[PDB]
From a paper:
Human protein E6AP/UBE3A, the founding member of the HECT-type ubiquitin ligase family, was originally identified as an associated partner of the viral oncoprotein E6 of human papillomaviruses (HPVs). The E6 oncoprotein from high-risk HPV types hijacks the ligase activity of the host E6AP to ubiquitinate the tumor suppressor p5313, leading to the aberrant p53 degradation. The HECT-type E3 ligases have a characteristic C-terminal HECT domain consisting of an N-lobe and a C-lobe that are responsible for E2 binding and ubiquitin acceptance, respectively.
After several rounds of 3D classification, we identified five distinct conformational states of the E6AP/E6 complex and resolved the structures of these five conformations at resolutions ranging from 2.6 to 4.4 Å. We therefore assigned the five conformations into one of two classes: attached (Att) or detached (Det). In all three Att conformations, the catalytic C-lobe of E6AP attaches to E6, whereas, in the two Det conformations, there are no interactions between the C-lobe and E6. We hereafter refer to the three Att conformations as Att1, Att2 and Att3 based on the distance between the tips of the two towers in a descending sequence: 74 Å in Att1, 71 Å in Att2, and 66 Å in Att3. Following the same nomenclature, the Det two conformations are referred to as Det1 (76 Å) and Det2 (61 Å). (2) When the two towers leant beyond a threshold, the Att conformation changed into a Det conformation. Since the interactions between the C-lobe and E6 do not exist in the Det conformations, these interactions are likely to be dispensable in terms of the dimerization of the E6AP/E6 protomer. The Det and Att conformations of the E6AP/E6 complex presented in this study should be structurally relevant to these accepting and donating processes, respectively.
Numbering used by the authors:
A (entry chain B), D (entry chain D): 12 to 30, 35 to 146
B (entry chain A), C (entry chain C): 125 to 158, 161 to 169, 231 to 364, 369 to 385, 387 to 474, 476 to 563, 570 to 668, 679 to 685, ...
The structure:
């Protein structure tokens, strides 16, 4: 639970390996999908103790799953800092396309496009540098 | 002196008592009108509405004071409108809000000169006024009495009469040209508190059982924190704590807080994406108190329709990449006499396996038949008959209720909550006649006392005559002391207060704390994303669900949508409206059971047609696609579809 | 008198010769400026440019005449701008167009006071001016000589310098705030005719073999009439008959008719949907002469990219309803040494079975390999080597040509035309070095004489020295008399005129009337919907296909698109641009064969990167996603990918 | 050729029947698909002498085939009568969604929506009353 490393940056250590299996594709992953799990910072999926990862084809799908379904509301730049008054660096915002946690510099992806930030599943999202 | 006040105004008429001239005497009120009331009114705001009622009542004689009462406003408009979003004056201090009483306090704002003057500059000041410096004046505003409400209920309304019709607005000017909407957004709350109590709500609206695809995605995220921290709550009452969740009483009702010349002319279609998605330009959905219920439903229908579009946008993605089966509709399977079982357990496959597909538009299939709008009245007749045992009837009032001994068929309330949740998605009425207390409870407010006369009037006076006058009441034959030792309690009347409360908490909550909740579990499963707690009042959810009896046959003769054989001057078209308008006291009430299938009206009601040609209807679209003959052929053919009910 | 004219202006200086004062003398030219030249100029328009050159040359002394020359214009602006789209004055009569010579005839419009005055009112008059009353003034305007062109080529251009930069335009003001674009739309055609002849074009661009699904849909419609009646032709030349299809010569070239301060600042992305779809608001694509070729390609790339989007919008619809296989890319299969066969016959399955999928973006697959941008240079090296036998070389000029004895491998020109048609779709260059006559012929203009010096300069002077001076020339060893009995014709020079024409019609047309045509059949198959005849000039199609050698490494160090391990201050990023900018006479020419794979530049060129780390490139995106070390490690690693060419 | 009735209003006569087979669905059609073939006025499909019809599911598809592929250009109301100068009643315009030939009253479907008319396959189209 608290012991099992929910980040592959910590699971590369506890596998006692050197710098990868996803449960969606049910297959063995690659080193392109160890950088982005360290970069999208997703949680390690567990199968009643059996830890697995995501693959990018199933990062681009199973987050596409929720974002067209679990949609709640999208708000202007004038409000997302107003009604929160929480720092944008502290503001836990990931990406809506690739689930990458937004750097605050990359929080001008909607603040500096005269755009709006999105919230899926009660967990706010948006566009990133790759999108 | 800069600020003119109670003793300086004490001798204004006295200083012109001997010379009868008043030229700089009225300039100063056009100077003190431009923050200067604060030192002019103090001894957290001023209380000088009596004081101006010493001014204006001693200055009843000089009706030239209304010149600079109004002439000050023309420069007072850009005074207080720039400093709030560019200079942000009340951000640092809570003392900028003390000025605002000067505009509303005038007793002659009801006159049309002050109509186009007094509100829209001040609503512009009230527009960028913050959450407290709007919301805490309301705490001062609810303290006003009903006659003061009666003097206020017109005076903010009177601009909302005529400003909204000065705009003959296109699809380009919805919210930006309306501005005193945001005024009325606030001063609606004046009539909210000026009974409301946040105490007697429901328990928490528990979340849907998660999507098993998202359940594994819940192992790709934190699974513990962002469990619906935003259901997109209303923000004004988070600046209050006290809500529109629980408006038990007004002083003057909320239909006063609706404008129908506003309602039609607006753009409401994208207003849900002016609500869920944010747009400052064009919004009125963000003030859901002001919409008419027959127009409020549209965006609620649209939130489903957009989710149906989004479910149309997600139905690809398992025949897309997984290549599997494609459900571009919510396909439901029943039998016409094996429904209640098979209606349920198909949706249970849409519960434990596909808990997404329920917001998607219902398309019913059967087993024997080789259709949805009529289908609800099929459902809610057998549902709302006591053949299942879920339900009693208060047939005297003709108001409907659960049976408290539906201890096992609350597993069959599991259907109807989805069904009621689906009855609101397709925008169909139900001939459900539930009392108002259902809809308070559907909006998460547990049973008060006063809602009993909605549900059971025979209990209503028989529980308040106790107040007008032992402490236990039976329930159907089971006597039950609410308060412990409520048997031995005499007809001493001090105890009886909770006996009002507890037996009202019994039959409305402590009987059906699981019955309605197992009902509401099915309801809120498919209606969580719908903003019905946001948009609909509990009274609005009534007239959505139960429907209005304003049978206007004279609508769909003008807004019919027929093609493929029914042009505007069709012969039977020029022979049919004279049939539906040849009606008497009963021919009206039998019309709608054949076309749509209901008894009460949902002006967006429409029709459809194409080409013994008896009355036929494709009964999922109000689509009477019957043939071309004359009147006297068709004089009974409509009855023949209706006679064998 | 109302209209002042040649003999009334003969004594204007004479009537002030004795009194030296000219106050109403200049009011009248500010009166005759507001249709009144018509009676003032006549003896199908006036010829009085000599006459104003008797005015202005005798009124060289009074430079106050330029006051009311310009001061008349300020009221002349709304005079002639309202009457054309509200009153539509020249619709009934062809005599409203006679006025228009007064604005252009002034010799000092090149000065900036007349810049912001003389054009934009008159271009507004020229804007709603009709197809003839623009297009037939051009017939009068092409009669102007080169010095008159030299006086005109600046004076309409001089506003297009500064009016387009007065707007610091956003994505809201592209065409509506530009207006003398539509002026320049016309007066570009002044330099078209003022050689052009509509005679020597190609035969008709035959249609694609139809889609077999549409072929049955061609049994659902008429199958006989609407066989591409609109390829969306240019409308101005349909009001002429004489086209921009065939601009053989200018008097001053068409790069004068380009503005680069215009080019960047505009919105060109939706300009194709301001061209294919129509929008009057925001257009410049409808004036394709004015775009820079490195910007013109974008919308042409976008028309493919939108078709690729539309092919992305049509790839669903057979895995949607037919449930069959899904090609969301144009998947092409080859082998690295079995290409030319298998490159072709896969596209033949995309010809006789799926003739839609070729506009869809190419994604190459192989057999052994388990990529497209590099892939063309793989194709066009083996294609453009004579190992196949399609091709000669004029290696002296280094200009490339067909082999006329490719009588059977014109079945292998079937590939390259699709390939050249695909080389323009992905926006890649080719290192094809074809002459200009290919691109005249690619724009449907058969070979003139003068294009021979593009193709074969050794034939060029050897065919015009005949003019500077028997009537048959060999072709490779086969002598062939073009004119019959061209053997016996002496060096008499009267016959020789057609001998210029026919041998130029031989090697450019009568040799390759099927070779290029079987080549162009593959080309126009996939490029019919592309507006390359519309947008691209034949010179523009050259620099699209053959590419420009403006190797600007100092672009993509500023506009790189890297992510996933290459942030702005990356260490190797702060160590790499100093490597590419440490270049000498040869290090430049070897750079691009590794990154993209070419030798010449297509400022929208970009880069990509992420994280013996030698030079690596994902060679379909210019994606050098190499690792993080220092300079002196990487000092040869770039060479190591490039040394083994 | 000229003899075979390219309209089912004439093929109901030459079948010597009373008021239906499509080659796309390869099945036998219905009387809902004899009114609209008389109303969309499509051509009768022939199989080297074998005459067939369209079904509406394959009217809604095989015209959806061309309209997303054979697209040429769309123009304002200000131009489609200008560059033609052909009467809108004479203007052979069908529908883009259902291939119904537009009545000139129904040629306000884009003229009176501030909309534009479309041209697919060099054969102009647009919206109709049903759409
Ligand atoms: Zn996976
Ligand atoms: Zn992304
Ligand atoms: Zn079919
Ligand atoms: Zn249609």
């Amino acid at each position: 639970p608290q012991e099992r490393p929910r980040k592959l940056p910590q699971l590369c250590t506890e596998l006692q390996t050197t710098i990868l299996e996803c449960v969606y594709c049910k297959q063995q992953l690659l080193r392109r999908e160890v950088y982005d799990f360290a970069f999208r910072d997703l949680c390690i999926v567990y199968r009643d103790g059996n830890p697995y990862a995501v693959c990018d084809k199933c990062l681009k799908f199973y987050s596409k799953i929720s974002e067209y379904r679990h949609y709640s509301y999208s708000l202007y730049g004038t409000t997302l800092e107003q009604q929160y008054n929480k720092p944008l660096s502290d503001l836990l915002i990931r990406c809506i396309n690739c689930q990458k946690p937004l750097s605050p510099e990359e929080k001008q992806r909607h603040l500096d496009k005269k755009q709006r930030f999105h919230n899926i599943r009660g967990r706010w999202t948006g566009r990133c540098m790759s999108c | 002196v800069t600020y003119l006040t109670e003793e300086k105004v004490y001798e204004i008429l006295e200083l012109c008592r001997e010379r009868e001239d008043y030229s700089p005497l009225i300039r100063v009120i056009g100077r003190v009108f431009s923050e200067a009331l604060v030192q002019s009114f103090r001894k957290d705001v001023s209380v000088d509405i009596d004081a101006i009622r010493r001014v204006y009542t001693r200055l009843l004689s000089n009706e030239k004071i209304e010149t600079a009462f109004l002439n000050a406003l023309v420069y007072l408009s850009p005074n207080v409108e720039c400093d709030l979003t560019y200079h942000n004056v009340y951000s640092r201090d809570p003392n900028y809000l003390n000025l605002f009483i000067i505009v509303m306090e005038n007793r002659n704002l009801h006159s049309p000169e002050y109509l186009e003057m007094a509100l829209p500059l001040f609503c512009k000041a009230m527009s960028k006024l913050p959450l407290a410096a709007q919301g805490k004046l309301i705490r001062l505003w609810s303290k006003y009495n009903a006659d003061q409400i009666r003097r206020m209920m017109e005076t903010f309304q009177q601009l909302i009469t005529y400003k909204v019709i000065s705009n003959e607005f296109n699809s380009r000017n919805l919210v930006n040209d309306v501005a005193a909407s945001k005024c009325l957004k606030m001063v609606y709350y004046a009539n909210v508190v000026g009974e409301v109590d946040t105490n007697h709500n429901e328990e928490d609206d528990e979340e849907p059982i998660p999507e098993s695809s998202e359940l594994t995605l819940q192992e790709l995220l934190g699974e513990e924190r962002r469990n619906k921290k935003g259901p997109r709550v209303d923000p004004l009452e988070t600046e209050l704590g006290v809500k529109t969740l629980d408006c038990r009483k007004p002083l003057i009702p909320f239909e006063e807080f609706i404008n129908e010349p506003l309602n039609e002319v607006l753009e409401m279609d994208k207003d849900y994406t002016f609500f869920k998605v944010e747009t400052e330009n064009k919004s009125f959905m963000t003030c859901p108190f002001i919409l008419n219920a027959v127009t409020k439903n549209l965006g609620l229908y649209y939130d489903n329709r957009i989710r149906m579009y989004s479910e149309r946008r997600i139905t690809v993605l398992y025949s897309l990449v997984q290549g599997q089966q494609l459900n571009p509709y919510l396909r439901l399977k029943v039998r016409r006499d094996h429904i209640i079982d098979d209606a349920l357990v198909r949706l249970e496959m849409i519960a434990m396996e596909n808990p997404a597909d329920l917001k998607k538009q219902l398309y019913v299939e059967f087993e024997g038949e080789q259709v949805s709008k009529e289908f609800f009245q099929l459902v809610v007749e057998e549902i709302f008959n006591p053949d299942i045992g879920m339900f009693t009837y208060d047939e005297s009032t003709k108001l409907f209720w659960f049976n408290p001994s539906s201890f096992e068929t609350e597993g069959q309330f599991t259907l109807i909550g989805i069904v009621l949740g689906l009855a609101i998605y397709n925008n169909c009425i139900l001939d459900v006649h539930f009392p108002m207390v259902v809809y308070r409870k559907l909006m998460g407010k547990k049973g008060t006392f006063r809602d009993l006369g909605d549900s059971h009037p025979v209990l209503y006076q028989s529980l308040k005559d106790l107040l007008e006058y032992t402490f236990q009441i039976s329930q159907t034959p089971m006597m039950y002391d609410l308060k412990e030792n409520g048997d031995k309690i005499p007809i001493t009347n001090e105890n009886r207060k909770e006996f009002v409360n507890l037996y009202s908490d019994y039959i409305l909550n402590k009987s059906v704390e699981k019955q309605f909740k197992a009902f509401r579990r099915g309801f809120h499963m498919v209606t969580n994303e719908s903003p019905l707690k946001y948009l609909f009042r509990p009274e609005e959810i009534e007239l959505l669900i139960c429907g209005s009896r304003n049978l206007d046959f004279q609508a769909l003769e003008e807004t019919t949508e027929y093609d493929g054989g029914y042009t505007r001057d069709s012969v039977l078209i020029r022979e049919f409206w004279e049939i539906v308008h040849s009606f008497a006291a009963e021919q009206k009430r039998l019309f709608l059971q054949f076309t749509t299938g209901t008894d009460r009206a949902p002006g967006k009601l429409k029709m459809i047609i194409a080409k013994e040609r008896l009355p036929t209807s494709h009964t999922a679209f109000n689509v009477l696609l019957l043939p071309e003959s004359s009147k006297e052929k068709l004089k009974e053919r409509l009855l023949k579809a209706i006679t064998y009910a």
